[PDB]
Each structure stands twice: as structure tokens, then as C-alpha cells.
Amino acid sequence: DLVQTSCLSMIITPAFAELKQQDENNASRNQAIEELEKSIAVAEAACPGITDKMVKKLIEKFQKC
Amino acid sequence: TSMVSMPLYAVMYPVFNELERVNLSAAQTLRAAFIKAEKENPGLTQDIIMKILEKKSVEVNFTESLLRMAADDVEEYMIERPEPEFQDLNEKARALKQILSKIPDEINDRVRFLQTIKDIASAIKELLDTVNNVFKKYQYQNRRALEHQKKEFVKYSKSFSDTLKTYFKDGKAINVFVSANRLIHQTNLILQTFKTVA
């Protein structure tokens, strides 16, 4: 792999695609997921690294217990 | 404010608060977006958290972890008012949630767990007594909401008791953890109702 990690493309996109596949013909759910991913991209453009920090803090809460 | 939406408030809100220290705008953008998605499809925030944990190889039970964090982030739930009656409500709420949060550690120690069950019943009684006192003190403001929340609490407490009884037969701990989280959620909803009495 060597070159290139982008928390949004690395973790969020595939996670959200997998989320949709838990219930594929759910229009309202898939729309909700799509809107949220778009807003995460807006936040990431305003503060590079913020998504990574969100995921880290999320994980930390569960590891610490 | 439904049960299924609990993880938004219990897990994500504290994360957003911490992100506010990095960048206020970005944090609020994430906050508003998670709130909107949860409103559109209750249960989504839970699914998202579990999926992210899986992608990061964090091998934990979500229900149990939620319960263990029940005493955390006190400022998100407490009534921010100085009068003794609100302090008393806060303290009764905190005591209940603290005892419940220790179930995952205590449940495998039978002697200790028997004591935990008695401490829970005592803490429930004292919370409900305080709730009724403050309700009367403020002249039955927020009446419909508080009567409904009190009714659901009593229902959830009976259901928690039934779950303990079953646990003594079948040893399936997860069911106790689910039922305990429900009581935590209902405690928080009652606290929230007292935020708007005057």
C-alpha cells in the first residue's frame, strides 16, 4: 500500500455503504445516511482532521470502558 | 428522546462537546447533522457507532459499554440549578445511575450482586420519593409529562425486576444490562422535565 491512508474515505464512506447494505430498499434510512455523510464532508472541509478526531474520541470512550 | 435514540445523547453528545474545543463550527456541523439523521431514522446513531467500532477492531459489547458509562458526563444530564430540591434530585439520580453502572462488574459475584439488587431498589424508592416531593413543591407544573414519565419509570422498574428473576434462572447477563439502560434513560428524562419548572 505504502502511499496514502483520509478518515472520511478510509472509515466513514465504507462504514456508511455497509450501513445501507444492512437494509438496502430503505429509502428514508438511506437518505438520512447520505445527508449525514455530506455534512461530515462539509465539517471536514472546514476543519481538516476533525473526522479523525471524532472517530478517535468515539473509540476512546469505549476502550476506556 | 426515545430509548432507541439514547446513544446520540450518551455517546455522541460528549464527543461533540470535546470537539468544540478543537473547532466550534465543525463540531456544531457534526452535532446538528447527527441530530437530524437520528430524527429522520431513530436507531441510526447506534448503528453508526457499532459500525465504526467494528471498522476500528474494537471488540466490545455495545449494550454493556453504554451501561458502564452511565455515571459519566454528569453535566449533560444534571439540573443546573442551585436550590436544594434540584440538588437533591441530581444526587438521587446520580446515586441510582452509579449503582446501575456497576452491574457489569458485580453481576458475576453472587453475594455482592444480591446486595447490589437491594441497593438498586433503595435508590429507586428514594429517587421516586424525591421526584414526588419536588413535583408537589412546584405545584404540579409539567403535569402530563411528569405523570407519564413516572408511569413509564414504574413500568421499567418492574420489568428490571422481572429480568433479575429470569437472570437467576438462565444466567444471561445481557438482558439485565438492556433493562438497566432503560432505567438510566428514564432517570435522565425525569431530570430533564424538572429543568423547566419555575
PDB file of C-alpha atoms in Angstrom:
ATOM      1  CA  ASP A   1       0.000   0.000   0.000  1.00  0.00           C
ATOM      2  CA  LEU A   2       2.814   2.359   1.092  1.00  0.00           C
ATOM      3  CA  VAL A   3       1.244   5.646  -0.154  1.00  0.00           C
ATOM      4  CA  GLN A   4      -1.939   7.188   1.357  1.00  0.00           C
ATOM      5  CA  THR A   5      -4.102   6.416   4.400  1.00  0.00           C
ATOM      6  CA  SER A   6      -8.292  10.434   4.796  1.00  0.00           C
ATOM      7  CA  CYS A   7     -10.557   9.257   7.638  1.00  0.00           C
ATOM      8  CA  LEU A   8     -13.679  10.102   5.596  1.00  0.00           C
ATOM      9  CA  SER A   9     -12.752   7.875   2.616  1.00  0.00           C
ATOM     10  CA  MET A  10     -10.988   5.250   4.793  1.00  0.00           C
ATOM     11  CA  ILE A  11     -13.550   4.702   7.516  1.00  0.00           C
ATOM     12  CA  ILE A  12     -16.743   6.723   7.071  1.00  0.00           C
ATOM     13  CA  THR A  13     -17.539   6.012   3.381  1.00  0.00           C
ATOM     14  CA  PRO A  14     -17.155   2.228   3.648  1.00  0.00           C
ATOM     15  CA  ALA A  15     -18.906   2.187   7.022  1.00  0.00           C
ATOM     16  CA  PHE A  16     -21.871   4.113   5.596  1.00  0.00           C
ATOM     17  CA  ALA A  17     -22.007   1.941   2.457  1.00  0.00           C
ATOM     18  CA  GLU A  18     -22.109  -1.105   4.734  1.00  0.00           C
ATOM     19  CA  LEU A  19     -24.810   0.589   6.811  1.00  0.00           C
ATOM     20  CA  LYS A  20     -27.013   0.942   3.713  1.00  0.00           C
ATOM     21  CA  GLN A  21     -26.463  -2.760   2.905  1.00  0.00           C
ATOM     22  CA  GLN A  22     -28.000  -3.743   6.283  1.00  0.00           C
ATOM     23  CA  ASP A  23     -31.344  -2.506   4.816  1.00  0.00           C
ATOM     24  CA  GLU A  24     -30.961  -1.851   1.022  1.00  0.00           C
ATOM     25  CA  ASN A  25     -34.517  -0.948  -0.015  1.00  0.00           C
ATOM     26  CA  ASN A  26     -34.958   1.553   2.877  1.00  0.00           C
ATOM     27  CA  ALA A  27     -35.392   4.935   1.175  1.00  0.00           C
ATOM     28  CA  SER A  28     -35.816   7.118   4.249  1.00  0.00           C
ATOM     29  CA  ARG A  29     -32.851   5.460   6.023  1.00  0.00           C
ATOM     30  CA  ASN A  30     -30.536   5.704   3.017  1.00  0.00           C
ATOM     31  CA  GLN A  31     -31.437   9.360   2.530  1.00  0.00           C
ATOM     32  CA  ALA A  32     -30.635  10.063   6.209  1.00  0.00           C
ATOM     33  CA  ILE A  33     -27.246   8.347   5.804  1.00  0.00           C
ATOM     34  CA  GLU A  34     -26.484  10.265   2.559  1.00  0.00           C
ATOM     35  CA  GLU A  35     -27.293  13.663   4.145  1.00  0.00           C
ATOM     36  CA  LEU A  36     -25.127  12.867   7.187  1.00  0.00           C
ATOM     37  CA  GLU A  37     -22.136  11.843   5.055  1.00  0.00           C
ATOM     38  CA  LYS A  38     -22.451  15.102   3.104  1.00  0.00           C
ATOM     39  CA  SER A  39     -22.470  17.134   6.349  1.00  0.00           C
ATOM     40  CA  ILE A  40     -19.425  15.231   7.606  1.00  0.00           C
ATOM     41  CA  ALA A  41     -17.654  16.245   4.361  1.00  0.00           C
ATOM     42  CA  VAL A  42     -18.629  19.893   4.985  1.00  0.00           C
ATOM     43  CA  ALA A  43     -17.220  19.701   8.511  1.00  0.00           C
ATOM     44  CA  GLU A  44     -14.028  18.025   7.274  1.00  0.00           C
ATOM     45  CA  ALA A  45     -13.548  20.831   4.682  1.00  0.00           C
ATOM     46  CA  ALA A  46     -13.954  23.481   7.432  1.00  0.00           C
ATOM     47  CA  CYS A  47     -11.520  21.717   9.826  1.00  0.00           C
ATOM     48  CA  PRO A  48      -9.190  19.161   8.234  1.00  0.00           C
ATOM     49  CA  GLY A  49      -8.683  16.209  10.599  1.00  0.00           C
ATOM     50  CA  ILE A  50     -11.968  16.725  12.536  1.00  0.00           C
ATOM     51  CA  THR A  51     -13.454  13.426  11.367  1.00  0.00           C
ATOM     52  CA  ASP A  52     -10.362  11.550  12.517  1.00  0.00           C
ATOM     53  CA  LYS A  53     -10.666  13.288  15.916  1.00  0.00           C
ATOM     54  CA  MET A  54     -14.369  12.352  16.100  1.00  0.00           C
ATOM     55  CA  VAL A  55     -13.569   8.677  15.443  1.00  0.00           C
ATOM     56  CA  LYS A  56     -10.668   8.729  17.948  1.00  0.00           C
ATOM     57  CA  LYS A  57     -12.771  10.228  20.751  1.00  0.00           C
ATOM     58  CA  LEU A  58     -15.577   7.795  19.942  1.00  0.00           C
ATOM     59  CA  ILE A  59     -13.194   4.808  20.181  1.00  0.00           C
ATOM     60  CA  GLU A  60     -11.531   6.185  23.306  1.00  0.00           C
ATOM     61  CA  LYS A  61     -14.865   6.279  25.159  1.00  0.00           C
ATOM     62  CA  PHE A  62     -15.344   2.512  24.592  1.00  0.00           C
ATOM     63  CA  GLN A  63     -11.749   1.433  25.229  1.00  0.00           C
ATOM     64  CA  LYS A  64     -11.658   3.379  28.493  1.00  0.00           C
ATOM     65  CA  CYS A  65     -14.865   1.437  29.134  1.00  0.00           C
TER      66      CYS A  65
ATOM     67  CA  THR B   1     -35.715  11.188  23.454  1.00  0.00           C
ATOM     68  CA  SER B   2     -36.983   7.694  22.691  1.00  0.00           C
ATOM     69  CA  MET B   3     -34.972   4.818  24.115  1.00  0.00           C
ATOM     70  CA  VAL B   4     -33.588   3.769  20.735  1.00  0.00           C
ATOM     71  CA  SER B   5     -32.069   7.273  20.302  1.00  0.00           C
ATOM     72  CA  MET B   6     -30.257   7.109  23.692  1.00  0.00           C
ATOM     73  CA  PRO B   7     -26.703   6.621  22.177  1.00  0.00           C
ATOM     74  CA  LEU B   8     -26.895  10.019  20.472  1.00  0.00           C
ATOM     75  CA  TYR B   9     -27.145  11.684  23.884  1.00  0.00           C
ATOM     76  CA  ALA B  10     -24.976   9.207  25.807  1.00  0.00           C
ATOM     77  CA  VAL B  11     -22.096   8.736  23.368  1.00  0.00           C
ATOM     78  CA  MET B  12     -22.105  11.365  20.635  1.00  0.00           C
ATOM     79  CA  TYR B  13     -23.032  14.487  22.660  1.00  0.00           C
ATOM     80  CA  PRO B  14     -19.916  14.235  24.870  1.00  0.00           C
ATOM     81  CA  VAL B  15     -17.748  13.679  21.769  1.00  0.00           C
ATOM     82  CA  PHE B  16     -19.212  16.815  20.127  1.00  0.00           C
ATOM     83  CA  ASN B  17     -18.566  18.788  23.365  1.00  0.00           C
ATOM     84  CA  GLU B  18     -14.898  17.706  23.249  1.00  0.00           C
ATOM     85  CA  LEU B  19     -14.716  18.584  19.532  1.00  0.00           C
ATOM     86  CA  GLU B  20     -15.992  22.116  20.337  1.00  0.00           C
ATOM     87  CA  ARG B  21     -12.547  22.716  21.895  1.00  0.00           C
ATOM     88  CA  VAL B  22     -10.919  21.918  18.503  1.00  0.00           C
ATOM     89  CA  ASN B  23     -13.238  23.859  16.199  1.00  0.00           C
ATOM     90  CA  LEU B  24     -16.618  25.220  17.252  1.00  0.00           C
ATOM     91  CA  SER B  25     -18.062  25.430  13.709  1.00  0.00           C
ATOM     92  CA  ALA B  26     -17.082  21.944  12.625  1.00  0.00           C
ATOM     93  CA  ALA B  27     -18.253  20.449  15.944  1.00  0.00           C
ATOM     94  CA  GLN B  28     -21.676  22.091  15.604  1.00  0.00           C
ATOM     95  CA  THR B  29     -21.915  20.956  11.993  1.00  0.00           C
ATOM     96  CA  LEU B  30     -21.367  17.360  13.106  1.00  0.00           C
ATOM     97  CA  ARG B  31     -23.753  17.756  16.064  1.00  0.00           C
ATOM     98  CA  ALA B  32     -26.621  19.166  14.005  1.00  0.00           C
ATOM     99  CA  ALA B  33     -26.077  16.518  11.310  1.00  0.00           C
ATOM    100  CA  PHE B  34     -26.221  13.606  13.790  1.00  0.00           C
ATOM    101  CA  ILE B  35     -29.334  15.099  15.426  1.00  0.00           C
ATOM    102  CA  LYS B  36     -31.058  15.434  12.023  1.00  0.00           C
ATOM    103  CA  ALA B  37     -30.183  11.888  10.935  1.00  0.00           C
ATOM    104  CA  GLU B  38     -31.400  10.401  14.229  1.00  0.00           C
ATOM    105  CA  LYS B  39     -34.697  12.321  13.915  1.00  0.00           C
ATOM    106  CA  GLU B  40     -35.134  11.039  10.352  1.00  0.00           C
ATOM    107  CA  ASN B  41     -34.341   7.444  11.317  1.00  0.00           C
ATOM    108  CA  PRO B  42     -34.300   6.600  15.033  1.00  0.00           C
ATOM    109  CA  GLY B  43     -31.632   3.965  15.784  1.00  0.00           C
ATOM    110  CA  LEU B  44     -29.166   5.127  13.160  1.00  0.00           C
ATOM    111  CA  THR B  45     -26.667   6.655  15.592  1.00  0.00           C
ATOM    112  CA  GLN B  46     -26.376   3.302  17.382  1.00  0.00           C
ATOM    113  CA  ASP B  47     -25.774   1.527  14.064  1.00  0.00           C
ATOM    114  CA  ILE B  48     -23.156   4.095  13.126  1.00  0.00           C
ATOM    115  CA  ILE B  49     -21.258   3.797  16.433  1.00  0.00           C
ATOM    116  CA  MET B  50     -21.236  -0.029  16.269  1.00  0.00           C
ATOM    117  CA  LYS B  51     -20.051   0.029  12.650  1.00  0.00           C
ATOM    118  CA  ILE B  52     -17.228   2.461  13.422  1.00  0.00           C
ATOM    119  CA  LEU B  53     -16.153   0.303  16.408  1.00  0.00           C
ATOM    120  CA  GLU B  54     -16.139  -2.769  14.132  1.00  0.00           C
ATOM    121  CA  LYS B  55     -14.057  -0.979  11.459  1.00  0.00           C
ATOM    122  CA  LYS B  56     -11.545   0.041  14.145  1.00  0.00           C
ATOM    123  CA  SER B  57     -11.495  -3.568  15.510  1.00  0.00           C
ATOM    124  CA  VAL B  58     -12.840  -2.585  18.947  1.00  0.00           C
ATOM    125  CA  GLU B  59     -14.294  -5.813  20.209  1.00  0.00           C
ATOM    126  CA  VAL B  60     -16.766  -4.754  22.889  1.00  0.00           C
ATOM    127  CA  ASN B  61     -20.428  -5.280  23.685  1.00  0.00           C
ATOM    128  CA  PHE B  62     -22.223  -2.024  22.927  1.00  0.00           C
ATOM    129  CA  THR B  63     -25.027  -2.503  25.486  1.00  0.00           C
ATOM    130  CA  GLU B  64     -22.613  -3.355  28.323  1.00  0.00           C
ATOM    131  CA  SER B  65     -20.304  -0.447  27.455  1.00  0.00           C
ATOM    132  CA  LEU B  66     -23.266   2.002  27.450  1.00  0.00           C
ATOM    133  CA  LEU B  67     -24.165   0.746  30.937  1.00  0.00           C
ATOM    134  CA  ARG B  68     -20.601   1.069  32.243  1.00  0.00           C
ATOM    135  CA  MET B  69     -20.630   4.735  31.077  1.00  0.00           C
ATOM    136  CA  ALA B  70     -23.931   5.526  32.836  1.00  0.00           C
ATOM    137  CA  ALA B  71     -22.308   7.533  35.651  1.00  0.00           C
ATOM    138  CA  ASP B  72     -20.227   9.612  33.139  1.00  0.00           C
ATOM    139  CA  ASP B  73     -20.873  13.050  31.631  1.00  0.00           C
ATOM    140  CA  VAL B  74     -22.890  14.170  34.694  1.00  0.00           C
ATOM    141  CA  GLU B  75     -23.175  17.771  33.390  1.00  0.00           C
ATOM    142  CA  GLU B  76     -25.106  16.670  30.308  1.00  0.00           C
ATOM    143  CA  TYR B  77     -27.974  15.379  32.463  1.00  0.00           C
ATOM    144  CA  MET B  78     -27.960  17.242  35.816  1.00  0.00           C
ATOM    145  CA  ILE B  79     -30.355  20.093  36.535  1.00  0.00           C
ATOM    146  CA  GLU B  80     -28.191  23.214  36.554  1.00  0.00           C
ATOM    147  CA  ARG B  81     -29.986  24.983  39.359  1.00  0.00           C
ATOM    148  CA  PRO B  82     -28.720  25.705  42.909  1.00  0.00           C
ATOM    149  CA  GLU B  83     -31.828  25.216  45.018  1.00  0.00           C
ATOM    150  CA  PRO B  84     -31.736  22.264  47.487  1.00  0.00           C
ATOM    151  CA  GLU B  85     -34.611  20.446  45.776  1.00  0.00           C
ATOM    152  CA  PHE B  86     -32.768  20.288  42.413  1.00  0.00           C
ATOM    153  CA  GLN B  87     -29.537  19.337  44.096  1.00  0.00           C
ATOM    154  CA  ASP B  88     -31.455  16.551  45.863  1.00  0.00           C
ATOM    155  CA  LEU B  89     -32.941  15.308  42.565  1.00  0.00           C
ATOM    156  CA  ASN B  90     -29.483  15.362  40.975  1.00  0.00           C
ATOM    157  CA  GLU B  91     -27.992  13.408  43.807  1.00  0.00           C
ATOM    158  CA  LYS B  92     -30.760  10.744  43.848  1.00  0.00           C
ATOM    159  CA  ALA B  93     -30.421  10.395  40.094  1.00  0.00           C
ATOM    160  CA  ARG B  94     -26.633  10.137  40.305  1.00  0.00           C
ATOM    161  CA  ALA B  95     -26.810   7.512  43.046  1.00  0.00           C
ATOM    162  CA  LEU B  96     -29.155   5.329  41.028  1.00  0.00           C
ATOM    163  CA  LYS B  97     -27.144   5.636  37.828  1.00  0.00           C
ATOM    164  CA  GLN B  98     -23.878   4.935  39.682  1.00  0.00           C
ATOM    165  CA  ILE B  99     -25.175   1.731  41.263  1.00  0.00           C
ATOM    166  CA  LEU B 100     -26.607   0.580  37.909  1.00  0.00           C
ATOM    167  CA  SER B 101     -23.326   1.320  36.103  1.00  0.00           C
ATOM    168  CA  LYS B 102     -21.504  -1.235  38.321  1.00  0.00           C
ATOM    169  CA  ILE B 103     -23.779  -4.146  37.389  1.00  0.00           C
ATOM    170  CA  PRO B 104     -21.381  -5.442  34.689  1.00  0.00           C
ATOM    171  CA  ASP B 105     -18.617  -5.775  37.271  1.00  0.00           C
ATOM    172  CA  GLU B 106     -20.743  -7.067  40.136  1.00  0.00           C
ATOM    173  CA  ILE B 107     -23.079  -9.451  38.404  1.00  0.00           C
ATOM    174  CA  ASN B 108     -20.612 -12.392  38.431  1.00  0.00           C
ATOM    175  CA  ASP B 109     -20.089 -12.127  42.199  1.00  0.00           C
ATOM    176  CA  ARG B 110     -23.309 -13.665  43.594  1.00  0.00           C
ATOM    177  CA  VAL B 111     -23.001 -12.434  47.173  1.00  0.00           C
ATOM    178  CA  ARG B 112     -22.123  -8.892  46.061  1.00  0.00           C
ATOM    179  CA  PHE B 113     -24.810  -8.891  43.345  1.00  0.00           C
ATOM    180  CA  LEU B 114     -27.520  -9.702  45.936  1.00  0.00           C
ATOM    181  CA  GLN B 115     -26.513  -6.575  47.810  1.00  0.00           C
ATOM    182  CA  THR B 116     -26.477  -4.554  44.516  1.00  0.00           C
ATOM    183  CA  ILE B 117     -30.103  -5.537  43.924  1.00  0.00           C
ATOM    184  CA  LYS B 118     -31.108  -4.223  47.361  1.00  0.00           C
ATOM    185  CA  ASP B 119     -29.129  -1.020  46.812  1.00  0.00           C
ATOM    186  CA  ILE B 120     -30.925  -0.514  43.460  1.00  0.00           C
ATOM    187  CA  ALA B 121     -34.355  -0.965  44.990  1.00  0.00           C
ATOM    188  CA  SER B 122     -33.455   1.504  47.745  1.00  0.00           C
ATOM    189  CA  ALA B 123     -32.107   4.079  45.261  1.00  0.00           C
ATOM    190  CA  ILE B 124     -35.239   3.740  43.060  1.00  0.00           C
ATOM    191  CA  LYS B 125     -37.509   4.356  46.068  1.00  0.00           C
ATOM    192  CA  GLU B 126     -35.568   7.422  47.147  1.00  0.00           C
ATOM    193  CA  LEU B 127     -35.493   8.890  43.625  1.00  0.00           C
ATOM    194  CA  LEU B 128     -39.258   8.419  43.234  1.00  0.00           C
ATOM    195  CA  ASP B 129     -39.945   9.930  46.678  1.00  0.00           C
ATOM    196  CA  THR B 130     -37.840  12.994  45.748  1.00  0.00           C
ATOM    197  CA  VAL B 131     -39.489  13.316  42.325  1.00  0.00           C
ATOM    198  CA  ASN B 132     -42.921  13.356  44.007  1.00  0.00           C
ATOM    199  CA  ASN B 133     -41.788  15.882  46.575  1.00  0.00           C
ATOM    200  CA  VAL B 134     -40.376  18.350  44.014  1.00  0.00           C
ATOM    201  CA  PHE B 135     -43.406  17.779  41.763  1.00  0.00           C
ATOM    202  CA  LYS B 136     -45.676  18.855  44.628  1.00  0.00           C
ATOM    203  CA  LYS B 137     -43.352  21.671  45.699  1.00  0.00           C
ATOM    204  CA  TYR B 138     -43.644  23.340  42.271  1.00  0.00           C
ATOM    205  CA  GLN B 139     -47.405  22.946  42.278  1.00  0.00           C
ATOM    206  CA  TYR B 140     -47.648  20.179  39.642  1.00  0.00           C
ATOM    207  CA  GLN B 141     -46.057  22.052  36.775  1.00  0.00           C
ATOM    208  CA  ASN B 142     -45.283  19.938  33.693  1.00  0.00           C
ATOM    209  CA  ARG B 143     -48.034  17.638  34.952  1.00  0.00           C
ATOM    210  CA  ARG B 144     -48.775  15.484  31.914  1.00  0.00           C
ATOM    211  CA  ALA B 145     -45.114  14.948  31.068  1.00  0.00           C
ATOM    212  CA  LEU B 146     -44.129  14.103  34.652  1.00  0.00           C
ATOM    213  CA  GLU B 147     -47.091  11.780  35.288  1.00  0.00           C
ATOM    214  CA  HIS B 148     -46.330   9.940  32.033  1.00  0.00           C
ATOM    215  CA  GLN B 149     -42.589   9.683  32.824  1.00  0.00           C
ATOM    216  CA  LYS B 150     -43.350   8.439  36.336  1.00  0.00           C
ATOM    217  CA  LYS B 151     -45.669   5.758  34.928  1.00  0.00           C
ATOM    218  CA  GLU B 152     -43.046   4.574  32.408  1.00  0.00           C
ATOM    219  CA  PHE B 153     -40.401   4.522  35.181  1.00  0.00           C
ATOM    220  CA  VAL B 154     -42.529   2.273  37.377  1.00  0.00           C
ATOM    221  CA  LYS B 155     -43.185   0.039  34.364  1.00  0.00           C
ATOM    222  CA  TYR B 156     -39.447  -0.151  33.545  1.00  0.00           C
ATOM    223  CA  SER B 157     -38.543  -0.854  37.138  1.00  0.00           C
ATOM    224  CA  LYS B 158     -40.982  -3.806  37.300  1.00  0.00           C
ATOM    225  CA  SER B 159     -39.538  -5.044  34.041  1.00  0.00           C
ATOM    226  CA  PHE B 160     -35.999  -4.708  35.520  1.00  0.00           C
ATOM    227  CA  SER B 161     -37.112  -6.830  38.495  1.00  0.00           C
ATOM    228  CA  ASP B 162     -38.535  -9.493  36.156  1.00  0.00           C
ATOM    229  CA  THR B 163     -35.271  -9.516  34.256  1.00  0.00           C
ATOM    230  CA  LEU B 164     -33.292 -10.173  37.504  1.00  0.00           C
ATOM    231  CA  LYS B 165     -35.577 -13.089  38.340  1.00  0.00           C
ATOM    232  CA  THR B 166     -35.028 -14.588  34.930  1.00  0.00           C
ATOM    233  CA  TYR B 167     -31.276 -13.980  35.167  1.00  0.00           C
ATOM    234  CA  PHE B 168     -31.134 -16.131  38.318  1.00  0.00           C
ATOM    235  CA  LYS B 169     -32.595 -18.987  36.211  1.00  0.00           C
ATOM    236  CA  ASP B 170     -30.751 -18.663  32.893  1.00  0.00           C
ATOM    237  CA  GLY B 171     -27.554 -16.673  33.657  1.00  0.00           C
ATOM    238  CA  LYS B 172     -27.899 -14.456  30.552  1.00  0.00           C
ATOM    239  CA  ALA B 173     -26.337 -11.173  31.712  1.00  0.00           C
ATOM    240  CA  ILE B 174     -27.100  -9.103  28.584  1.00  0.00           C
ATOM    241  CA  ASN B 175     -30.824  -8.994  29.428  1.00  0.00           C
ATOM    242  CA  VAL B 176     -30.105  -7.321  32.769  1.00  0.00           C
ATOM    243  CA  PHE B 177     -27.811  -4.822  31.020  1.00  0.00           C
ATOM    244  CA  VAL B 178     -30.574  -3.913  28.494  1.00  0.00           C
ATOM    245  CA  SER B 179     -33.133  -3.420  31.239  1.00  0.00           C
ATOM    246  CA  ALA B 180     -30.716  -1.332  33.377  1.00  0.00           C
ATOM    247  CA  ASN B 181     -30.009   1.020  30.430  1.00  0.00           C
ATOM    248  CA  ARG B 182     -33.740   1.665  30.159  1.00  0.00           C
ATOM    249  CA  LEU B 183     -33.876   2.790  33.775  1.00  0.00           C
ATOM    250  CA  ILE B 184     -30.911   5.074  33.197  1.00  0.00           C
ATOM    251  CA  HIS B 185     -32.671   6.654  30.175  1.00  0.00           C
ATOM    252  CA  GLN B 186     -35.884   7.182  32.166  1.00  0.00           C
ATOM    253  CA  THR B 187     -33.937   8.756  35.048  1.00  0.00           C
ATOM    254  CA  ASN B 188     -32.420  11.247  32.607  1.00  0.00           C
ATOM    255  CA  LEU B 189     -35.833  12.082  31.084  1.00  0.00           C
ATOM    256  CA  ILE B 190     -37.264  12.853  34.537  1.00  0.00           C
ATOM    257  CA  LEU B 191     -34.328  15.163  35.346  1.00  0.00           C
ATOM    258  CA  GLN B 192     -34.918  16.921  32.032  1.00  0.00           C
ATOM    259  CA  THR B 193     -38.569  17.579  32.883  1.00  0.00           C
ATOM    260  CA  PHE B 194     -37.586  19.444  36.048  1.00  0.00           C
ATOM    261  CA  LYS B 195     -35.376  21.827  34.027  1.00  0.00           C
ATOM    262  CA  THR B 196     -38.417  23.870  33.067  1.00  0.00           C
ATOM    263  CA  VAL B 197     -40.353  24.264  36.338  1.00  0.00           C
ATOM    264  CA  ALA B 198     -40.294  27.763  37.896  1.00  0.00           C
TER     265      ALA B 198
END
